[PDB]
Amino acid sequence: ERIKDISHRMSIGEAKARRAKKEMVEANLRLVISIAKKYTNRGLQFLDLIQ
DNA sequence: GCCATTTTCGCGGCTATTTTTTTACTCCCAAAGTTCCGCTATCAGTTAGTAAAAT
After folding, report:
1. Which nucleotides of B are covered by protein (CB under 7 A)?
2. Which of A7, A9, A20, A26 is 20 to 30 Å from the Cα of A36, by its Cα?
């Protein structure tokens, strides 16, 4: 019972942190693009710089 | 649901001989793996010397 409770609490915490981190990343994708716009034509393509 | 019209896809001669191209750009630090010089030590090859043999 105790290990099951600990596992459920840990899984919930990791899921919540992962969701929040995903929200932040999806919000700032546009900042990533704005930064990567300035390093084109240096051997890498635009999408590689974005990733 | 067939009849026509618009959209891709692939093609357009053979041999020679003369000749390179070119934009775009942080830094620092600590930690880790690699190299370059120097020394050692062993083995194998080469060479000098001397005895053994033959004339």
Report:
1. 24-25
2. A20
